[PDB]
Amino acid sequence: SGEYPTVNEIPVGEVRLYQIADGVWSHIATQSFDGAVYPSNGLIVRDGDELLLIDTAWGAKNTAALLAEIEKQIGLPVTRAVSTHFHDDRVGGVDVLRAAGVATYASPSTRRLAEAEGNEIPTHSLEGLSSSGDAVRFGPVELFYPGAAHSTDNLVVYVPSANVLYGGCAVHELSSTSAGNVADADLAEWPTSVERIQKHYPEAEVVIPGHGLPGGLDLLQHTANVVKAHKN
Numbered sequence: 134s135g136e137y138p139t140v141n142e143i144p145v146g147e148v149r150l151y152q153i154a155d156g157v158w159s160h161i162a163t164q165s166f167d168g169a170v171y172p173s174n175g176l177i178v179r180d181g182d183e184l185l186l187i188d189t190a191w192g193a194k195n196t197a198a199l200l201a202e203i204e205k206q207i208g209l210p211v212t213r214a215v216s217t218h219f220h221d222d223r224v225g226g227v228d229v230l231r232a233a234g235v236a237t238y239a240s241p242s243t244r245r246l247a248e249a250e251g252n253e254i255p256t257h258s259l260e261g262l263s264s265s266g267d268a269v270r271f272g273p274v275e276l277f278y279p280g281a282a283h284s285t286d287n288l289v290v291y292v293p294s295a296n297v298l299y300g301g302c303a304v305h306e307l308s309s310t311s312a313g314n315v316a317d318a319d320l321a322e323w324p325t326s327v328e329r330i331q332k333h334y335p336e337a338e339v340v341i342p343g344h345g346l347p348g349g350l351d352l353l354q355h356t357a358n359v360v361k362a363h364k365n
């Protein structure tokens with residue numbers, strides 16, 4: 134009823150949307166992994182009379198439910214999707230999107246890692262993002278490669294019309310006490326990559342983590358803090 138959705142407010146197998154700003158929503162779904170249940174976020178950005186999707190809803194059935202929830206709540210077609218790294222909370226559901234007519238995109242690094250890991254593979258490669266600090270425009274957003282952090286391929290997304298920074302899994306929520314699933318992370322480089330985000334997007338008003346509650350710019354420093362303590 135208005136608060137940011139958590140696992141306890143999303144019915145089984147469903148997705149909920151949250152209005153972040155004019156023409157910007159997050160999507161929230163839940164999934165089980167190694168015997169525990171986790172929430173995860175993505176983004177939806179209005180692109181005229183179409184929608185740009187950032188990240189799947191973590192699984193085929195969740196992503197089908199996402200498309201149905203978008204049709205119910207927004208009613209504009211999703212035409213393109215970008216996955217911000219290679220893990221299943223970002224690409225799991227790409228096959229569903231592709232069969233629903235959505236053009237799916239990721240960096241070549243993400244596509245290679247997804248392929249090698251056996252995860253679903255976005256169709257189209259996003260060039261121009263291979264060096265840290267690189268940025269490219271993609272419809273109503275800017276895509277930014279901050280350097281290795283949660284994964285070597287992680288991208289962040291900025292919505293300039295609303296000053297919304299979607300950090301993906303390189304950014305953690307304020308309540309977090311550890312650095313999440315770090316199996317593919319670079320804990321030594323992560324603070325430097327966060328510093329790059331801070332320097333590039335100093336006017337961000339909303340910061341959205343890959344998992345958990347949005348907040349403000351404090352999420353970036355908090356993330357650096359929890360990562361440094363995980364490493365040390």
Ligand SMILES: C[C@@H](c1cccc2c(-c3ccc(CS(C)(=O)=O)c(F)c3)c(C(=O)O)[nH]c12)n1cc(CNC(=N)N)nn1
Nearest residue numbers: 166171220221222302305309310311312313314316343344
């Ligand atoms: C599919 C994905 C995955 C599954 C389950 C949990 C998470 C979390 C996470 C875990 C805990 C918290 C709470 S908290 C910050 O308070 O600890 C959180 F907010 C997020 C993250 C993330 O952190 O983005 N991602 C996860 N995955 C798969 C792999 C590869 N694994 C490997 N052995 N090679 N890595 N991630």
Ligand SMILES: [Zn+2]
Nearest residue numbers: 218220283302
């Ligand atoms: Zn991940």
Ligand SMILES: [Zn+2]
Nearest residue numbers: 222302343344
């Ligand atoms: Zn994640």
